[PDB]
Write a protein that binds this ligand. Structure first.
Ligand SMILES: NC(=O)c1cc(N)c2c(c1)nc(NCc1ccccc1Cl)n2C[C@@H]1CCCCC[C@@H]1O
Ligand SMILES: NC(=O)c1cc(N)c2c(c1)nc(NCc1ccccc1Cl)n2C[C@@H]1CCCCC[C@@H]1O
Lengths: 445, 446
């Protein structure tokens, strides 16, 4: 095992990693901004280092300060969590050249999957089904771009090669909008990602968001740990996640999973990763790969029994995968509700002091949050303050437990999306299952 | 399938909240019956209906048979869940409930009566094939020559036990003939005063036993299953502190052997609902001591390793539904540890009442928190010291223990004294980390 690690993150994920470290007897170094002295994980860590003032650019995104804290404490590894520097290939490369273990994939793999054009090319080569599109970058020749748009099937989407998630996209209904659209995206991409490379892709009308969890040791072994349905979204931001995805057969799971596992070997993947797809008419279409742990990883842990953070730590330590594909079994169902310090109606973030707090309990109830009574949610960071995960023997039990747990959850002093989550659990279409990616916006409209 | 419309939760604290959650999941309307001191209980605050049944002393509230039955009638409830303790093993209450036309969420009154009489309960178990402690196999008379002959056949040390006794009450260890007559006479007088039943029996006293118990479920359709075992040996002066499932050192073959015998005994006695067969385990052999005719405090450790919601099964059985799982569907997976959290003084072990000023619950993968407490809540001095239960699960015993250590360190209960520090000490104990420690261990450590 790794003797001592730096947790290069904050909030709920930092607390998640800290628990995993403590379970394995790994010493923890909590690096934090001056605004995050009162974070729960900071108070629980063996050593703490203040890495700079409140803005992320000065603290959590500050590479030299993070490296220096790792050198000063005698740490051997760095876990970047999710967000911040987790998908920054230059950070991964610097961590390794400085002699530390980077708890993530190789910097080259981050670059390969990070550039969306080459990622799709790599997946097509690996045998992973992708969304029909340009299959390369787009030029200045409108005649070639229009011929490509008719080849795929209108409507189409203009995507930034350096973009990802919910940023760097523009939908095209017809050829009249096409020219203005290919130009606006290039200007936005060059300003936001410092790369003007764009590509064209088929805009799928009625798709579901289905993603595959993988674990690869970087020694030739790679396993798939079922799927997650993350279709309940608003402004390209996940709200509810669940595992397994409803309507996915053991045969469909096996088909897509084996392809994802094979793709890991072919790209030399190391650690935990997720292959995101759009699922429509019984077919999967690759969109992107998250080369880190995901926010929604707990729903996969509940249904497989696999602790995903401990496995990241074992792989980083140089241990080959002990878990064999034949040992991965889907059992029961899990639902995750993201808890955000925001007004759901207006999207207005709600930082501030939590005057009253009470977490739900019970069988199959998992609460993932650093929040406590008297704690101030700082205005400098993202709105996500916690995650409520409920497990049951079937989908209906997990939903029933989630309704009860949401009713027990008290967060006063700030605005939350708790009431929105209660509305989603009570939604008859959600209760039936299989709602598409556009459902939540339509329901709220 | 048909389900109970509304039930009265005839209990308080953590178990009342546990029962409330199971009801809500099943769409059953809840009736929280409470004493005047228990208006601010979490489950009372979450219940669909509330009925104040009397003042703080349990005799006028939680043990008050007419007021509890009256609250079921007033609210139009169809069933009564007694939880554990209070009226849960009271056969007169269960008889009065049935008589009043309400469902008693438990076994038949006559089954409670049968298992509540320790002499009759042993005779029924021995007849069914359940292994028993060698003993008198009937009541002791006043003839001391006969009592010395029974003691010689059993072999000293022996234990004199009250037929109306149970748990940690109504027993006396005898090491030789010199103490026999007086020990029998003293047990009789104590039994007459406490139980209005002076019947005593003799049992072989075991030197280093483990307290291992088998969980059962039996429906009204003739199905009876076993849900592995629990080791409750980590205890002090008849008070459980740590429980775990499955029991260390128990092989699948040993589990199958004892479990099948317990399942067969349910069928023979016409058992209904949740129940536990309590055993003393020593030298790879099981010895029946008593049967709990209700749910136990430590039921969550069995739920974690089997996936079975024991409270929801009680509610399903009571509604007239078959068991939701078959024996072949019951699988032991992983390991679970329960730390009882008490508002108690660590030097005296007596209840420590008062107001909770700051409260923080632990979280994480495999962490389960069973408690009604919240910040600002006042622990009343009228009832037991138990304020909560911390349950950690893992794919093996070591992971469960590692998760417990971290969970206990995150647990904050300020304003009152707790056994949190003692629980941290037990988790750090190398003999506990090895496992298989006997019932006498904790007292010897302290
Ligand atoms: N081909 C498509 O129809 C399509 C549609 C969407 N909405 C895509 C979508 C495809 N791909 C992406 N995202 C990746 C991306 C964005 C910008 C530039 C490149 C990439 Cl790879 N997104 C955005 C997503 C936000 C939430 C909805 C479901 C999944 C996505 O995370
Ligand atoms: N035969 C024996 O060795 C024996 C010993 C004890 N200590 C017995 C014990 C046997 N049996 C009982 N209890 C049941 C009982 C008591 C009085 C009268 C009838 C009964 Cl069934 N107890 C009380 C125990 C409390 C301490 C820890 C856990 C094991 C036991 O609960």
């Amino acid at each position: 095992m790794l003797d001592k690690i730096v947790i290069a993150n904050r909030g709920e994920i930092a607390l998640r990693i800290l628990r995993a470290c403590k379970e394995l007897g790994i010493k923890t170094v909590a690096v934090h901004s001056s605004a995050d002295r009162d974070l729960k994980h900071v108070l629980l860590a063996d050593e703490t280092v203040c890495i700079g003032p409140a803005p992320s650019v000065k603290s959590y995104l500050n590479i030299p300060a993070i490296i220096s804290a790792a050198e000063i404490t005698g740490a051997v590894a760095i876990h970047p969590g999710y967000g911040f520097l987790s998908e920054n290939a230059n950070f991964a490369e610097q961590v390794e050249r400085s002699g530390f273990i980077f708890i993530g994939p190789k910097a080259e793999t981050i670059r390969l999957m990070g550039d969306k054009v080459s990622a799709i090319a790599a997946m097509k080569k690996a045998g992973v089904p992708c969304v029909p599109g340009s299959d390369g970058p787009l030029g200045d020749d409108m005649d070639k771009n229009r011929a490509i748009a008719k080849r795929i099937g209108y409507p189409v989407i203009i995507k930034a090669s350096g973009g990802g998630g919910g940023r760097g996209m523009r939908v095209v209904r017809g050829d009249a909008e096409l020219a203005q659209s290919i130009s606006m995206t290039r200007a936005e991409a060059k300003a936001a990602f410092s790369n003007d490379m764009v590509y064209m892709e088929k805009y799928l009308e009625n798709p579901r968001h289905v993603e595959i969890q993988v674990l690869a040791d970087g020694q030739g072994n790679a396993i798939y740990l079922a799927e997650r349905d993350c279709s309940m979204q608003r402004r390209h931001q996940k709200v509810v996640e669940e595992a397994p995805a409803p309507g996915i057969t053991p045969e469909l799971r096996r088909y897509i999973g084996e392809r994802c596992a094979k793709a890991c070997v072919d790209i030399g993947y190391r650690g935990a990763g997720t292959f995101e797809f759009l699922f429509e008419n019984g077919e999967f279409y690759f969109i992107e790969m998250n080369t880190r742990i995901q926010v929604e990883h707990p729903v996969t842990e509940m249904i497989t029994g696999v602790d995903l953070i401990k496995e990241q730590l074992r792989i980083a330590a140089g241990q080959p995968l002990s878990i064999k594909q034949e040992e991965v079994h889907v059992r029961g169902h899990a639902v995750e509700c993201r808890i955000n310090a925001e007004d759901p109606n207006t999207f207005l973030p709600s930082p501030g002091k939590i005057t009253r707090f009470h977490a739900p309990g019970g069988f199959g109830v998992r609460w993932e949050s650093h929040i406590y009574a008297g704690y101030t949610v700082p205005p400098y960071y993202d709105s996500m303050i916690g995650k409520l995960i409920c497990y049951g023997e079937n989908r209906d039990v997990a939903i029933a437990r989630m309704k009860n747990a949401l009713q027990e959850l008290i967060i006063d002093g700030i605005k939350t999306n708790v009431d929105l989550q209660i509305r989603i659990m009570n939604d008859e279409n959600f209760q039936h299952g299989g709602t598409n990616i556009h459902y939540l916006e339509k329901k709220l409209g």
